[PDB]
Amino acid sequence: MIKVEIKPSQAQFTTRSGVSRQGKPYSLNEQLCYIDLGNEYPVLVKVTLDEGQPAYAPGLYTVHLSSFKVGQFGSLMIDRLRLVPA
Amino acid sequence: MIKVEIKPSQAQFTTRSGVSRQGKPYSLNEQLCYIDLGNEYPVLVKVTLDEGQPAYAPGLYTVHLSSFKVGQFGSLMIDRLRLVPA
Numbered sequence: 001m002i003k004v005e006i007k008p009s010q011a012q013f014t015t016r017s018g019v020s021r022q023g024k025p026y027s028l029n030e031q032l033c034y035i036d037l038g039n040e041y042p043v044l045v046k047v048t049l050d051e052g053q054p055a056y057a058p059g060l061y062t063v064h065l066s067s068f069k070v071g072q073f074g075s076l077m078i079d080r081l082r083l084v085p086a
Numbered sequence: 087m088i089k090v091e092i093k094p095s096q097a098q099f100t101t102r103s104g105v106s107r108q109g110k111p112y113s114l115n116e117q118l119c120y121i122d123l124g125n126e127y128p129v130l131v132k133v134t135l136d137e138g139q140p141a142y143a144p145g146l147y148t149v150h151l152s153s154f155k156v157g158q159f160g161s162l163m164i165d166r167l168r169l170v171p172a
Contacts, residue, residue, distance in 0.1 A: 043156055045161065065124045077164060
């Protein structure tokens with residue numbers, strides 16, 4: 001299991017906006033977190049939230065299976081990192 | 087944890103070859119596996135092995151932390167799916 005931590009300082013998201021190729025508006029909410037990848041300290045990683053979802057609260061989390069998909073070359077890829085409480 | 091299975095029929099790898107941009111030869115060994123992504127059946131996924139590593143034997147495996155890296159846009163990515171016995 002991947003250990004992810006939202007620190008007290010990372011309890012908010014920011015929003016980016018724009019317009020798609022054929023005219024539709026979009027909004028993306030992004031939040032930062034720390035993920036332990038086995039180096040001397042955890043590293044900073046950007047998470048993009050799914051529509052209608054609030055910011056994850058501070059605490060420990062792991063990665064949900066729905067984060068992954070098979071890509072166009074037949075290898076596993078991360079679609080969006082989706083988190084669940086540890 | 088991601089459940090990965092190498093079936094008896096997937097016990098071998100195949101090798102692709104070529105030449106890099108500036109003249110170096112390369113060889114890539116690829117093996118197939120089944121990964122449970124929570125749908126009605128596991129799906130077929132291609133794994134590229136690391137240099138000097140044999141094919142994984144049939145059995146159950148999970149994903150090692152070294153499979154992941156932070157990409158150039160600051161989000162988590164899979165580098166290469168690296169497996170360890172379950």
